[PDB]
Amino acid sequence: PLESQYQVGPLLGSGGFGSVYSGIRVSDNLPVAIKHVEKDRISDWGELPNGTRVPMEVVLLKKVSSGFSGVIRLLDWFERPDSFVLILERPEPVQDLFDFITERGALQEELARSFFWQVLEAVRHCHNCGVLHRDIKDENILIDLNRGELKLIDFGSGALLKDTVYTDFDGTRVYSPPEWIRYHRYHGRSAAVWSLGILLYDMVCGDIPFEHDEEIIRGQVFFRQRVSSECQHLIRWCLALRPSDRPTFEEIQNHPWMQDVLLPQETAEIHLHS
Numbered sequence: 249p250l251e252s253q254y255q256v257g258p259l260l261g262s263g264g265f266g267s268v269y270s271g272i273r274v275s276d277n278l279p280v281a282i283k284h285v286e287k288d289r290i291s292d293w294g295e296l297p298n299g300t301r302v303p304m305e306v307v308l309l310k311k312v313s314s315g316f317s318g319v320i321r322l323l324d325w326f327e328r329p330d331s332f333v334l335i336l337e338r339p340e341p342v343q344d345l346f347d348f349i350t351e352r353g354a355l356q357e358e359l360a361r362s363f364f365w366q367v368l369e370a371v372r373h374c375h376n377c378g379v380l381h382r383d384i385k386d387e388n389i390l391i392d393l394n395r396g397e398l399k400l401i402d403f404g405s406g407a408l409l410k411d412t413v414y415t416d417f418d419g420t421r422v423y424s425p426p427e428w429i430r431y432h433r434y435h436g437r438s439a440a441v442w443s444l445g446i447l448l449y450d451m452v453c454g455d456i457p458f459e460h461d462e463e464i465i466r467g468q469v470f471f472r473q474r475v476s477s478e479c480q481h482l483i484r485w486c487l488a489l490r491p492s493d494r495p496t497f498e499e500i501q502n503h504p505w506m507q508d509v510l511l512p513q514e515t516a517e518i519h520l521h522s
C-alpha cells in the first residue's frame with residue numbers, strides 16, 4: 249500500500265530539503281504533505297526502536313511525535329529503492345512565516361510575542377524528546393491560520409541532542425552562531441538560542457540582522473525598525489557573542505518582554521482576521 253492510500257497533489261516546496269507535495273489521505277480525506285528525500289542526498293542515518301537504517305530525519309520526527317501541535321507530526325513513511333517518502337500532517341489553511349513576513353513586513357510586537365513564545369514551546373518540546381532541530385528559521389515554521397498555531401517543520405538538518413560539542417553543521421548559515429563560523433564548534437542549546445535571536449529580529453524587523461560572516465562574528469545589532477527597548481534587550485541577549493552569556497530557554501520565557509502572551513486563538517482572532 250502507498251499509491252492507493254494517498255492522492256498526490258501539487259508541489260508545495262523545492263529546496264535543500266527536497267520535494268514536498270500536497271496530498272490527501274484517501275482513507276478519510278485528511279490533508280497531508282508528502283515529502284520525498286533522495287537516499288544519495290541523505291548524509292546521516294539512525295535506527296528505530298527496532299528498525300532498519302532510516303534517515304536521521306525519520307528518527308527525530310518519531311521522537312517528537314505526539315498530540316502537541318507545536319511540531320509537525322509524522323503520520324507514516326515508506327522506503328522506496330532510491331528514496332524515502334514521509335507522510336506529514338498538513339494544516340489548512342496554512343502559510344509559512346517567511347511568506348507571512350514577506351507579505352506583511354515587520355510584525356507588531358504583540359504578534360511577534362505570540363509567535364516567538366510558540367516557537368519557544370516547540371523547541372523546548374524537541375529538546376525534551378532528545379532532538380535538536382538546528383535549522384530554526386522563518387521558512388521552517390508553518391502558521392495554522394485558523395487556529396493561530398505555529399508548527400516547526402523540516403528536521404532534515406537535525407541531530408540527537410547531546411551535551412558534548414558538535415563539529416558538523418548543515419542548517420542555514422545566516423542563522424548559525426559565531427562559534428560555528430569562527431571555530432566549527434558549537435553546543436546545541438546555546439546555538440539554538442542564537443538562531444532564535446535571529447528569528448525574533450526577523451519577526452520584528454522584517455529581515456535578518458546579518459548577511460555575511462564578518463557581521464555574524466562582529467555581533468553588532470542595528471535596528472532598522474522601531475523596536476521596544478525590552479525586545480531589543482532580549483534580542484541582543486540571544487545574540488551574545490559568548491555562548492555562555494546567552495539566556496537559557498527559561499530566562500528567555502521569564503524575560504519582561506515575554507509576559508502576557510496571547511493564546512494562539514486570541515492571536516488568530518486579532519492578527520489573522522479569522
Ligand SMILES: O=C(O)/C=C/c1ccncc1
Pocket residue numbers: 260265268280281283320336337338339390401402403
Ligand atoms: O517537514 C517538512 O520538511 C515539511 C513539512 C510540511 C508540512 C506541511 N506543509 C508543507 C511542509
